[PDB]
């Protein structure tokens, strides 16, 4: 199934996944695409932050679901 990952900059990344895949797995696919190390990735979906060692089905991630890759900012 395809899912989508949108970044805070507006960019849309398409991934090929299966629901049994771990969040670690998804994160390594994002790394292949964007060059972002897994430990620097904050991924949210449906009011939850996706944690290492859990699966897509643990967060109810269906086909076509959009995940958001987010950041902390330092200005203030």
């Amino acid at each position: 199934m395809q899912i989508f990952v949108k970044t805070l900059t507006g960019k849309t990344i398409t991934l090929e996944v299966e629901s049994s895949d771990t969040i670690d797995n998804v994160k390594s696919k994002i790394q292949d695409k964007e060059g972002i190390p897994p430990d620097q990735q904050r991924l949210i979906f449906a009011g939850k932050q996706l944690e290492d060692g859990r699966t897509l089905s643990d967060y109810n991630i269906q086909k076509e679901s959009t995940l958001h890759l987010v950041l902390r900012l330092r200005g203030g």
Partner: protein, 1006 residues
Amino acid sequence: AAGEIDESLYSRQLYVLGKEAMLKMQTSNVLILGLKGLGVEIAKNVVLAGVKSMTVFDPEPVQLADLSTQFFLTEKDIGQKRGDVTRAKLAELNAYVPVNVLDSLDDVTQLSQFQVVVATDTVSLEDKVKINEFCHSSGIRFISSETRGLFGNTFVDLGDEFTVLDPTGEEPRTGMVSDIEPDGTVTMLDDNRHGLEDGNFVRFSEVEGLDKLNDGTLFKVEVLGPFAFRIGSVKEYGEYKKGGIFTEVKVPRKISFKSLKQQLSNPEFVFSDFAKFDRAAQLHLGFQALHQFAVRHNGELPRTMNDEDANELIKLVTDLSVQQPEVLGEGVDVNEDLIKELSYQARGDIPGVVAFFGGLVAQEVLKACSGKFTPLKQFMYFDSLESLPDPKNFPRNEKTTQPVNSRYDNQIAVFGLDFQKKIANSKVFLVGSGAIGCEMLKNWALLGLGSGSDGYIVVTDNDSIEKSNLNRQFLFRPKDVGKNKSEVAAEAVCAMNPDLKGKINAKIDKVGPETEEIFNDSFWESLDFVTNALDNVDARTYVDRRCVFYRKPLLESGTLGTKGNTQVIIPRLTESYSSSRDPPEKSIPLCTLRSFPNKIDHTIAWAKSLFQGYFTDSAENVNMYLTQPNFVEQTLKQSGDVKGVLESISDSLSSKPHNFEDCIKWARLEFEKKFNHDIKQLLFNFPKDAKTSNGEPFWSGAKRAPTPLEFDIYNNDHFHFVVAGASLRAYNYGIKSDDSNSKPNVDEYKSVIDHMIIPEFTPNANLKIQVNDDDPDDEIDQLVSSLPDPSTLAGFKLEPVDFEKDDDTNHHIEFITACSNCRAQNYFIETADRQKTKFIAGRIIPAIATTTSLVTGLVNLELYKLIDNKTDIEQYKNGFVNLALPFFGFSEPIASPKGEYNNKKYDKIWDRFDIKGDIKLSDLIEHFEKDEGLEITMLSYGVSLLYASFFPPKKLKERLNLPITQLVKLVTKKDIPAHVSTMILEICADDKEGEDVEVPFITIHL
């Protein structure tokens, strides 16, 4: 005198919006209808941003309850018109923006004088539809917004044709190309990512062999993977040979909006929180139902916490869903508790929600004026119902939420009297009194936070107010420049709410390792919670660690341009700030800086460090040498770059200028060295046509073969390199500038330069140059014996430059821009202007008030959850935003990791072993075995090992009887300082089975 932007005031905003957008904003007149909280918040942000004019309409008389969120009203204004009384305060925010009052709106035709009309909560729905029809049909962009207690919405209609000029505000992607195949498959140089997306467009330069592909034609991108993309057949253009840079171009986009009346019946939603997307249709019905409720009750909203009215609101929503089943969907019921809450809260006026909508709507106003960023299209609803306290602790009913004849009455409408008293009685620490901090203190003044007799606010900031701050630190005025941020902010919010008079303690101390005497145990322990309003990661990490050590909650937030975030850190519950890492800053390889630049960032960094060297470092060094009789001896035994320190001293004291003319000469000769000679040397070692061992050309890709510069005073950069270099050199040596009163005269510099004999370049055949960062790379006695004896220079002092990016008169950015651009010319890199140079050299963070208010609003909706001591992690929301898109997303905090030793669970962040007193080592070891089942195996104080199980008996006999402070003394040879009240010790330990286990740290309370 318009077509130009005041950089000194708008500098930070300018980096977010850009000059074109701001020039359009400066031709736009804006009208706001309604100046309750929401309106004044919108208006403040829009006036700070800089539009051509702002006009406000609110003839309603001020009542006490309006002050809930209207921070420019005072009890003195009661009875007078909101518009009239607010106007002069909005005007003081930005002298460049006239603020007028519209007396009357009976004649709608008045609307035509305006480009953007915003209608707030004070305008009936019926009037909104008329106004919007007038606006839409006549080319006037229209926005509305409403807040009701913890709920809110906004609607945007920019008309039938609106052109977005730039959808995100991101830097265009750029990159180097190593191949373009005949079908248009573009391969990137090496491992450089293009970073594009399907549908982006690009232009090209420097592609040899495909000549017209460089003429500015756009090509649409098809992404092949991270390192390739495709642009359509290029065989018609020629055959690729070498070189190439692609630059992303944002094309315009035309978009179409529908009217309020059409979108009422068929809305297009943007979600404010995807966990809540089901609610956006419910609230859309519910907000319509409020308006129907008002029509049936003579303009009035439902009564606060009133059941009869709530059932009427639910009947009204139920009637809308039966009339329009597609709205919630086939067989989707009305969410009756949700709609009940909407009714119950309808009169509430909550500071955080007003801030969130005020920032969001203000930013939509600026999009409407400029075509910068992607507009909200078209409706967004929001709620922060999680902010409600547990009704077990703070019951909400008609008695507890009733008005009490006070400015807080419409916060009491939501939360009740007792909760509002607890807010008043909170003890809070705010670290930072800049953008977030001003917004924060404004919100806290509106909450009454710390106004109660058991409460207070402490705020601290070491910095003083600078001009560019006035664009987003709304408590400061031009006359406050040079004063202390925290002190001026504290005074401003007491004028907004006198309940805070004498309850805010403004300090001017930095929070850090060096101020633990002021910010001591007693200080931290007294607090209910802490809030950050910071501009750097180190300060954030420091506060986070304190909050962990003292077990206090922390509210964190940040911004970058339109981007922002919130984080809540809750003791014994969540991760802390330090628990996760953020992307570090990219570092430029040293080879690229030294010899092979290809972007302006590289030349700016090189220039910035040349600046540091010529004007700061080499002066500090001279002064240390003339005042430290051991300096030469210390330098030889302890510097990395020894020869360089001693040559800087030698060159600073032999070349001594005697007048300004010598300073001009020195600068011109530096031009020769850096942009002619040094380049020639690099070319001697690697000629233009040189090739690698493989026969490929050496100068390709990232390596661009330079050309030496022939000084030309008519070239802006050459001229300015000599002007700035000379004036700074003069500063260093305390010589009067021929330009310290005046602009520089070209003819005057020219006749000095024209009389100079410039020495010719001689190659030095010995110098190898380092190509990669991997590859590696006695004469000193001569250099030392050449130094003058300091007693020949008694009283001589050089004056080092302290980099100041924000004083246009001091030559700093002038030097760095020119020095950077001259190198840029060497390597055929596009030159940059002062503003951009200042952004990069000065490390300026793009900032704007809209985002600052919105993020601060969201922090203050989390704050309500600290007031109720929520321990359910699922109630809390970390927030992430980008107003450009617009995007809002939220996530529940991550739980603190947990561990176990023996049968004992503990929190790996928040738990520690608290030991009372300067305990003897033996007692400490015995205590751990007897009370925790832990066999201590290593015990450390910072870097010092104090005990270990492998110590032989002789070593243990020296230690076992020592109190911890005396044990630290024995090992480090240093006493613990007297002000230190605690010592953290790290232990390793074995558990009852003899197995190593992780365990918390120890704290010694002295």
